[PDB]
Amino acid sequence: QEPGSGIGYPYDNNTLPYVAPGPTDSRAPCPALNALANHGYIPHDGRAISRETLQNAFLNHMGIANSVIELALTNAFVVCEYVTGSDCGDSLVNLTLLAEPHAFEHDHSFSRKDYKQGVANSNDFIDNRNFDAETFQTSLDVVAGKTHFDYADMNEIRLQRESLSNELDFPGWFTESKPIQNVESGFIFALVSDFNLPDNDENPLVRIDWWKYWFTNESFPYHLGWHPPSPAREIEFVTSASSAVLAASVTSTPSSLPSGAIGPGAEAVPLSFASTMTPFLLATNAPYYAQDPTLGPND
């Protein structure tokens, strides 16, 4: 928000306003990076981004500690090298390349379509990067009529998304990605679980309105009473939430689940790509921004 507004105080004492991305700006498949870039905590154009820039932005403006993004930074830079064909050093070329499919970006996202979702021909591809309201609604629908949800509910959401994706993607495309998605599950609990409940750290419940605001608007739900977690969330919370989601008992099993969908997931590890492998073409669509309604500087 505008620095003088005090909307982040006393959790964030140095806020910057929301500014919608322009048609030439680079945005990511990540609602967190997009919110940061929309506020200029990382470059508004989404280009040439250092590790320390990302670390400071997450820590000071989202209450996410360095430990949480250590692997994410490693993978971002592996993907940058893979896509561009050369070492990216400590300057991530842009956010858009992070939507390289079957890499860091993965199938069965909560709020994005798959790279080959619903395509009539094997060579087609679509926008697997920008926020997709319909896709997100498929996640929200699992928890319809609720204000909060728990680990078991999250497990049902990711299962619904795996089911839909496996049914709708071009035959042969769908590839399950439990370890990456469920880090991101942990991330959701880390950012938008309800810290105003007495047992948040041990039994966190996501506030659905907070989640919806963050994903739809790619800005921070201050107007709904959200603030950056304090103290900043650490990696242990995230991987614990991740394991807890996948350990949760399934009481409604979707059809067309990939094999082994139900049960624990592997620990996330650094990505690696064979030097002979040419990257898939990136979707070229202009960055998404909220239009219903459009956001002001303090939203």
Ligand X SMILES: *[C@H]1O[C@H](CO)[C@@H](O)[C@H](O)[C@@H]1O
Ligand Y SMILES: *[C@H]1O[C@H](CO)[C@@H](O)[C@H](O)[C@@H]1O[C@H]1O[C@H](CO)[C@@H](O)[C@H](O)[C@@H]1O
Ligand Z SMILES: *[C@@H]1O[C@H](CO)[C@@H](O[C@@H]2O[C@H](CO)[C@@H](O)[C@H](O)[C@H]2NC(C)=O)[C@H](O)[C@H]1NC(C)=O
Ligand U SMILES: *[C@@H]1O[C@H](CO)[C@@H](O)[C@H](O)[C@H]1NC(C)=O
Catalytic residues: 184
- Binding status of residue 30 toward ligand HEM by CB under 6 A: yes
Measured from the CB of residue 286, what is the shortest distance to ligand Z in angstroms?
A: 9
Q: How far apart are CA 289 and CA 294, in angstroms?
A: 8
- Binding status of residue 112 toward ligand HEM by CB under 6 A: yes
Nearest Cα to Cα of residue 133 among 159, 111, 117, 107: 111
Measured from the CB of residue 266, what is the shortest distance to ligand Z in angstroms?
A: 27
Q: CB nearer to ligand X: give 74 or 240.
A: 240
* Residues of this chain, 218-257, that bind ligand U according to CB under 6 A: 223
Measured from the CB of residue 127, what is the shortest distance to Mn ion in angstroms?
A: 11
Q: CB nearer to ligand HEM: give 7 or 103.
A: 103
Q: CB nearer to ligand X: give 133 or 266.
A: 266
Q: Which two tokens stand for residue 48?
A: 């040439």
Q: CB nearer to ligand Y: give 136 or 288.
A: 288
Task: Report how many residues bind ligand Z under the rule CB under 6 A.
Answer: 10
Residue 130 carries which side chain, given as an amino acid letter?
N
Residue 30 labelled as part of a binding site: yes
CA separation, residue 259 to residues 98, 161, 162 (Å): 27, 14, 11
Q: CB nearer to ligand HEM: give 31 or 221.
A: 31
Choosing from 96, 109, 177, 193, the residue that interacts with ligand Z (CB under 6 A) is 96
Nearest Cα to Cα of residue 93 among 80, 82, 79, 78: 80
Choosing from 127, 150, 184, 299, the residue that interacts with ligand U (CB under 6 A) is 299
Contact (Cβ atoms closer than 8 angstroms) between residue 186 and residue 239 = yes
Among ligand X, ligand Z, ligand U, none, what does residue 26 contact (CB within 5–8 Å per kind)?
A: ligand Z
- Binding status of residue 109 toward Mn ion by CB under 5 A: yes
Choosing from 36, 68, 76, 295, the residue that interacts with ligand U (CB under 6 A) is 295
* Residues of this chain, 270-289, that bind ligand Y according to CB under 6 A: 284-286
- Binding status of residue 86 toward ligand X by CB under 6 A: no
> What angle, rounded to 10 degrees, do the helices at 235-247 and 66-84 form?
80
> What residues line the site for ligand HEM (CB under 6 A)?
29-33, 54, 58, 64, 68-69, 72-73, 76, 98, 104-106, 109-112, 184, 187-188, 190-191
> Which residues bind to ligand Y, rule: CB under 6 A?
284-286
Given the rule CB under 6 A, which residues bind ligand Z?
Answer: 26, 83-84, 93-94, 96-97, 279, 281-282
